[PDB]
């Protein structure tokens, strides 16, 4: 299964949800890169909540 | 089972629309009437080997 993410959708995710941007700030430049972070987020319980 | 994501940097949207119209046009071509159906073939020579 494939999901498409535009950068406008990423900006809307960051603006509408501060928790995702909070995880992005301390996870993406530190340990693992951006698409791995989005895959982990979409496979997480936070996306379901 | 597996999760795959697509990241587009706001430039390849026109490419996906080009693909979408390309399956659209091949579907309309494969559902088009044949040339012998929309046009009368009696004005041309008879079929043969």
């Amino acid at each position: 299964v494939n999901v498409n993410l535009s950068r406008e959708k990423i900006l809307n995710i960051f603006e509408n949800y501060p928790i995702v941007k909070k995880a992005y700030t301390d996870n993406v430049p530190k340990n693992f890169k951006e698409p791995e972070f989005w895959a982990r987020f979409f496979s997480s319980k936070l996306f379901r909540k | 089972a597996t999760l795959h994501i697509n990241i587009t940097t706001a430039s390849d949207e026109v490419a996906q629309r080009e693909l979408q119209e390309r399956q659209a046009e091949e579907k309309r071509k494969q559902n088009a009437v044949p040339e012998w159906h929309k046009q009368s073939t009696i004005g041309k020579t008879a079929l043969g080997r």
């Binding site: 698409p35 791995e36 895959a39 | 089972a1 597996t2 999760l3």
Partner: peptide, 24 residues
């Protein structure tokens, strides 16, 4: 089954990561 499912998921995430890094 559980270990092969979770290891399949983690290699799928790594495959997405290195595919993106090869593209970028």
């Amino acid at each position: 089954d559980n270990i092969k499912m979770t290891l399949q998921q983690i290699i799928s995430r790594y495959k997405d990561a290195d595919i993106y890094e090869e593209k970028r």
